[PDB]
Design a protein around this ligand. Sequence first.
Ligand SMILES: *[C@@H]1O[C@H](CO)[C@@H](O[C@@H]2O[C@H](CO)[C@@H](O)[C@H](O)[C@H]2NC(C)=O)[C@H](O)[C@H]1NC(C)=O
Lengths: 534, 123, 227, 104
Amino acid sequence: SPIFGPEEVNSVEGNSVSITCYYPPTSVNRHTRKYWCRQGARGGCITLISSEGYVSSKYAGRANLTNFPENGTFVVNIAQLSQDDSGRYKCGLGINSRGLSFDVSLEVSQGPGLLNDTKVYTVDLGRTVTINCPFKTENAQKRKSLYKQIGLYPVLVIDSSGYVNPNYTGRIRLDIQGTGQLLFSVVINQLRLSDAGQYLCQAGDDSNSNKKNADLQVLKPEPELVYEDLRGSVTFHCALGPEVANVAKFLCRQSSGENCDVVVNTLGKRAPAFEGRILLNPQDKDGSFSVVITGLRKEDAGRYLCGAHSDGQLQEGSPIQAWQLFVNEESTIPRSPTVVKGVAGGSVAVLCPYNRKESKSIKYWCLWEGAQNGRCPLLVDSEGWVKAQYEGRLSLLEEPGNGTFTVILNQLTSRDAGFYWCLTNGDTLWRTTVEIKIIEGEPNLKVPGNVTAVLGETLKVPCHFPCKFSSYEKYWCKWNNTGCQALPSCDENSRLVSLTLNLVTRADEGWYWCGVKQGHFYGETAAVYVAVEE
Amino acid sequence: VYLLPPAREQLNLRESATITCLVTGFSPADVFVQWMQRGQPLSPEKYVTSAPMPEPQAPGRYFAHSILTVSEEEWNTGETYTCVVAHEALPNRVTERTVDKSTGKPTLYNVSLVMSDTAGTCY
Amino acid sequence: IRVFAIPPSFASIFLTKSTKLTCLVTDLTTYDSVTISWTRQNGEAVKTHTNISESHPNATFSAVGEASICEDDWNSGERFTCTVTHTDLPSPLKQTISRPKGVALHRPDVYLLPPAREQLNLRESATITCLVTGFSPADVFVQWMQRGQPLSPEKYVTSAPMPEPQAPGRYFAHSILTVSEEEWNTGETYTCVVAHEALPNRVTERTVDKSTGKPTLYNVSLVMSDT
Amino acid sequence: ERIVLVDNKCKCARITSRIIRSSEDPNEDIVERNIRIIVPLNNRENISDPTSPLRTRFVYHLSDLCKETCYTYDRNKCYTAVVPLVYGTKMVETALTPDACYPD
Ligand SMILES: *[C@@H]1O[C@H](CO)[C@@H](O[C@@H]2O[C@H](CO)[C@@H](O)[C@H](O)[C@H]2NC(C)=O)[C@H](O)[C@H]1NC(C)=O
């Protein structure tokens, strides 16, 4: 189950092929057997190539197997295929007898052709293609038309008089070029799976009838395998062309009965299960763009499609792009709390994890925005930049420092509720998301309100705390881009840690915080702004 | 604390899905109990709470009860209806336990021992 | 006058961190004033060599050339030269040794076959075949170990590397041990250990007794309580 | 769809469960407790001292492990027994299983 690879791969004889299978990057899977085996109706994998060196006697020179522990991958290259290789296979690790493995299907077919009267034509679905067909010199004013031989009979797709197949109507044009050129072309729009077949040219009604038999293949996209862990994040790169820039975009996910369910639209539509944890970047010069999904769940694995349509949904004959997704479930992403509850006027504290190796990056923090094509601007970083609207009540900090840091946000309000993302400058990119709910009550900390003061004296401001904060150390700090630093020797029994300012200048202007420590973790704080008068 | 499921014959009238949470042999009284359903406390009237009447055979210990009903049609989603006890004499002062349909007792086993030298591994 | 240049085993290093390198000349003439000098590839000489050999009893005369280096130097792989300068042929012969470069790492796969039941019917002696396989580079080291006491090597004999028929690069080796059948009939398991520089902590090992190896008898007695 | 009640990777036990939501009759369903064990019949009783007898009994008080002497080498966390080597004696480490004791 924790192994991942491509389900079915097709090629034709004489060609090479290269298969990639994925494993979690743990120590053993970076340092133990990988294999490619073949089963049958006889009960057992027969090993064909191994990571330990052994190659089957029938596969000497044919194939080899390589492991990239850094990618968490091992690769299988097969060349010189034949029709005797089509069957059921499995990638896997460790002892063949167990199933730390993944099943693969393989179908090999002969290289067709031999027909000089018909060439190959493989194109993409929903795209445009055109067929060029010659006529002899006597084909001046003579019927120019194509015919699709479907089973028993040939039917017509475009005439020389304006008729067109109602299955195909409006997607087609006939061109006979001037300059004494003796060919013609047929252009088709909205390429569909219901279009693949064998055509036939014609040049006129007469006995001449310069026919040209033709094929029509349509290239569905080969799926791409994506490997992400549980409670992790993923970035998809959709790569449509500039030819659908005006047209909207979409993203669906495959389901049972050939039915995408949409997850987000250029029309602002969005799946309710994926509310919050989805982003969408603006489109590029080529219309290229990317979709960021965070906090993936066990049912989120599967095939994904991104496209471009007027309705921003699935239809027959529209350009698409595919992905195949896998969720690990043998994950290393630490389970962090997802929902964090606060009260109006209260505080919140959020623990944000990241990969331990890139601890010297620049943490960021962004707010998700709906009612849009989805947006998420920054709010704070680790150098100390902060959004201009939140001076005083917000700071982040690297106290735990082992891939985990803490964020403290006090003076909570019910208007602030929503979803928050955590970012990093590292190449690996977790985007852990936490939701803030607001409930009823008053915060545990008690501090007087916003107060003015005279210049140049001694002033004291109190902060009592409840009995549940009685087992900690208590402190005051001065808020700034640097955050907190406590002021040692302001205390009582389990209440009333009080700030005292011996002498004061207006350089001490600003917000101050009163808070408690959890040994090496942080807790509730509260804030008060102080002015200076004279 | 235990959490007994309804009776099988209860589950043939096809309306009343009784559920029983409980508490046994403890000192002292004043204990508080409540039922939690997916991190969401139930309706306080939905259940009914006992009072800590004393033990029969124990020297002086206490015990109480609480019962709750739901649609037996609901006893197909289940969601294990976690009953949150709240007693002072607990390491974190809460000893939650919960029970659902899938919990309890099955009457269809299928043990499946295997046997091999290819072991000592536990994949 | 024939000289063996003896590079220390990776095992000798890793169990000593003392990478002495030596060269022996065998069945020469032991005059006195026998002189051999260790030099690097640069020509520059290195530390000297003491406790040198003397005249053999059976005229197969010898002289040990001791030396030392830093381990990383050998890892760096530069040629090392002890040269014989004795009046027998005052022409300076050249013994140049190095470390090969480009050899990949590959692990021993130590199976351990138990004595054939047939040999148990000649009724005296039993033989066990510790095996190593499919590994690179050459020069595995092995010894045998049982009941927490080491087995002095005159009990066991070991092969040397020689390429696999199938693996283009990987060598293998053996080891053989001879023991009284009653001793193997006693139970009295045996453990063969291997040390080799593709092995994680450098040392793996396996064991076998009468019961593990090819038993005719499988006696499971498993109890499964409280389903 | 099953619900792994227990998965003890050092006994190779795995009690799952699955309600067999029946033919769409009323609630005459029976829940179902699959079990599975892969007993080795190769290892020691002191799993981490290959100088002991093999094993005969395999006792599964499922009560105990529905929650430390358990007898399969767990794949991921690896073992060792310091072992003497002689080149003079030296009392030195080992790696009783490979491909998991790799300090990497
Ligand atoms: C029998 O097993 C026990 C525990 O399963 C072993 O006890 C300790 O094992 C560690 C393993 O690293 C050693 O470092 C300790 O020295 C062992 N303690 C003792 C008192 O032996 C024990 O080693 C096993 N039996 C033997 C003979 O090793």
